[PDB]
Ligand binder design. Structure first.
Ligand SMILES: COc1cccc(OC)c1-c1cc(C(=O)N[C@]2(C(=O)O)[C@@H]3C[C@H]4C[C@H](C[C@@H]2C4)C3)nn1-c1ccc(C(=O)N(C)CCCN(C)C)cc1C(C)C
Length: 438
């Protein structure tokens, strides 16, 4: 009683946010104008898959929601009968060829960049996608002859042999072949790209491969069970099949409806990650030009790596004052900690960059700040033997006696590594503390 009503609520809900979701996606990518060519041609293939997803929701779902679900006689006529399975057939090819075409174009860009330069174009892609949608429609024409009305049911109008033949050809070159081709190229290209990686066009590639990875997986998730259902008709000849048929078909509508919401959601999340990742690399590498541009875009000043290394940790460690300066200018945290519990002041004192040590303190770095090891900036300056830094550290209220978990003072470490000059400074500095205390 409430079962049929339960599906209605879901199937109608999928139609609303699905039609709109894909609709919004089609208008979004239309107005979109990326400077990198690959970014555009990728989004033309995404826009092509959004149409395929939209057509399925507008034409097929209503026929399913009523005849297939709600009201178990055929009420759409032979024109609508042949049309339902035509459009549904046409969308599988359209989706399949796009998934392949995208992977081919994307593969070429990575593995044959110079060959691709002479071949690929926004113009040719935009045209070629029209040719896809034609071929998709032509390959779907057979299903017009393969279906008809009978006694009132839109049942097949050809032999089981000819029916088992078309589903075989359908499932082969509208799922099996494309998945196979996409999976091979998306693996060969990915391997090449991580090797090439180990800028604008290279950024578009990293995005493009990330997209195609998400596309193919999403494509395989929903269409596999659908094509598995089709495979049954070809080969197999108790009541689980009926349950599998309904779930496999329903999954297509769910995917088509949520994918635009997901893609839009995943984009923003990965965009946040990619911008943040870019800054960490840029700060460590010393490419100040990027860092300045990345900050304006809206990258998090207090991003952290797997270790817990923020831009200020990397910039101070590598010794890029220009970056350390602009990082603090864009509200970077001077007292930020990593895994071990090192502050930028630890790493600036470690490397020995005097100017950076001064700036960190001037912007309010913790001078006695201790890590889990028990070590402090003064220990690291004495350790490496930076006689200039120990001076400016001692100036800014540094605890000379402060010992670590190894029971060693900076004066001990200074004496240990036999930096005679630096060791004499701490002795005199320590004496002053006794007079100050007394
Ligand atoms: C041999 O076929 C199967 C074997 C095992 C599982 C299957 O699908 C889950 C199937 C199965 C596949 C299809 C199928 O592809 N149906 C079509 C399709 O939807 O793609 C339909 C009907 C024909 C014209 C077009 C194109 C296809 C063939 C629309 N229907 N169908 C199917 C589904 C349910 C029932 C059904 O209601 N049953 C009586 C289930 C009985 C199960 N006991 C045998 C245990 C019957 C079939 C066909 C055999 C006609």
């Amino acid at each position: 009683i409430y079962s049929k009503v339960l599906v209605t609520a879901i199937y109608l809900a999928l139609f609303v946010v699905g039609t709109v979701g894909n609709g919004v996606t089609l208008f979004t990518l239309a107005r979109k104008k990326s400077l990198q060519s690959l970014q555009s041609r990728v989004d033309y293939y995404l826009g092509s898959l959004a149409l395929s997803d939209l057509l399925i929701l507008l034409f097929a779902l209503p026929v399913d929601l009523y005849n297939f679900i709600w009201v178990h006689p055929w009420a759409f006529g032979d024109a609508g009968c042949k049309g339902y399975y035509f459009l549904r057939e046409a969308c599988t090819y359209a989706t399949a060829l796009n998934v392949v075409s995208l992977s081919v174009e994307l593969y070429l860009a990575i593995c044959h960049p110079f060959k691709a330069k002479t071949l690929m174009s926004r113009s040719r892609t935009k045209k070629f996608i029209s040719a896809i949608w034609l071929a998709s429609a032509l390959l779907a024409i057979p299903m017009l002859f393969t279906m008809g009305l009978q006694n009132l049911v839109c049942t097949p109008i050809v032999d089981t042999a000819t029916l088992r033949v078309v589903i075989q050809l359908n499932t082969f070159m509208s799922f099996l072949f494309p998945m196979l081709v996409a999976s091979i190229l998306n693996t060969v290209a990915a391997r090449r790209l991580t090797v090439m990686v180990h800028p604008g066009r290279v950024q578009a590639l990293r995005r493009g491969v990330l997209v195609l990875r998400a596309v193919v997986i999403a494509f395989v998730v929903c269409w596999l069970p659908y094509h598995v259902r089709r495979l049954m008709f070809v080969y197999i000849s108790f009541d689980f099949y009926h349950y599998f048929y309904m779930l496999s078909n329903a999954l297509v509508y769910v995917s088509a409806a949520i994918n635009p919401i997901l893609y839009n959601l995943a984009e923003d999340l990965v965009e946040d990650w990619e911008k943040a990742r870019k800054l960490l690399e840029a700060a460590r590498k010393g490419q100040d030009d990027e860092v300045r541009i990345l900050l304006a875009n809206g990258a998090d000043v207090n991003t952290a790596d797997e270790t817990g290394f923020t831009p200020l940790h990397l910039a101070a460690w590598e010794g890029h004052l220009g970056i350390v300066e602009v990082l603090l200018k864009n509200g970077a945290d001077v007292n930020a900690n990593d895994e071990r519990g090192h502050t930028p002041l630890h790493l600036a004192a470690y490397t020995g960059h005097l100017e950076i040590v001064e700036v960190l303190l001037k912007n309010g770095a913790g001078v006695n700040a201790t890590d889990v090891i028990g070590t402090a900036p003064l220990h690291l300056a004495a350790m490496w033997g930076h006689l200039e830094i120990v001076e400016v550290l001692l100036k800014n209220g540094a605890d000379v006696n402060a010992q670590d978990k190894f029971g060693k003072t900076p004066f001990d470490l200074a004496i240990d590594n036999g930096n005679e000059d630096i060791a004499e400074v701490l002795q005199k500095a320590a004496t002053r503390e006794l007079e100050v205390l007394f």
